[PDB]
Amino acid sequence: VTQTMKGLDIQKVAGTWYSLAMAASDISLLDAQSAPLRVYVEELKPTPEGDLEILLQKWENGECAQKKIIAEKTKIPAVFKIDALNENKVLVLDTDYKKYLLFCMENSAEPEQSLACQCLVRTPEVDDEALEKFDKALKALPMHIRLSFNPTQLEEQCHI
Ligand SMILES: [Pt+2]
């Protein structure tokens, strides 16, 4: 279970983002460049109807491939339905829209084996305010792996 952005203005998360940091409940979800949930968000695209398209990069067949996940709005605020990366939900935890956004993905069937969270930033500075916000949010969650990236890796295909 989770603590979410219940006042989320979906339209204001539009545009460019970089993955600064990631955390997962299970080491195996992030423990290699090919791990199923090691994904790098490039862009969030709200639809006119309040759905969300997430553009990301993922090492696949020995290439940095572009993926688009379609996230459909639900009757619960800040919770979107997906069918991707063996996940079925996206939760937005916290954002100021202009600097940082924290979100998680999970399988509702097995959240403690599926839970992956990301710190997104608007610009490739090692955002210590963003990392601090992510730290505060992860305080609550049962995370056993935490990864961070340097400014340089944010602007690279699939973070080097
Ligand atoms: Pt909030």
Author numbering: 3 to 162
Provide passages from the article that reported this PDB entry.
Since the protein binds anticancer Pt compounds, it can, in principle, be used as a nanocarrier with controlled release properties for these molecules.
Crystals of OXA/β-lactoglobulin adduct were obtained using soaking experiments: crystals of the ligand-free protein, grown using a hanging-drop vapor-diffusion method with a reservoir solution containing 35% pentaerythritol propoxylate, 0.2 M KCl, and 0.04 M HEPES at pH 7.5 (protein concentration: 30 mg mL−1), were soaked for 3 days in a solution of the reservoir with OXA. Analysis of the X-ray diffraction pattern indicated that β-lactoglobulin crystals grown under this condition belong to a new crystal form. The final structure contained two molecules in the asymmetric unit (molecules A and B hereafter) and was refined to an R-factor of 0.212 (R-free = 0.284) (see SI for further details). As expected on the basis of the statistical analysis carried out comparing the structures of the Pt-protein adducts with those of metal-free proteins, the overall conformation of β-lactoglobulin is not significantly affected by OXA binding. Access to the side chain of Met7 of molecule B is hampered by the crystal lattice. The Pt center coordinates the S atom of the side chain of Met (SD atom) with a Pt-SD distance of 2.48 Å. Since the Pt binding to the Met side chain could be reversible, our data suggest that β-lactoglobulin could be used as a Pt-based drug delivery system.
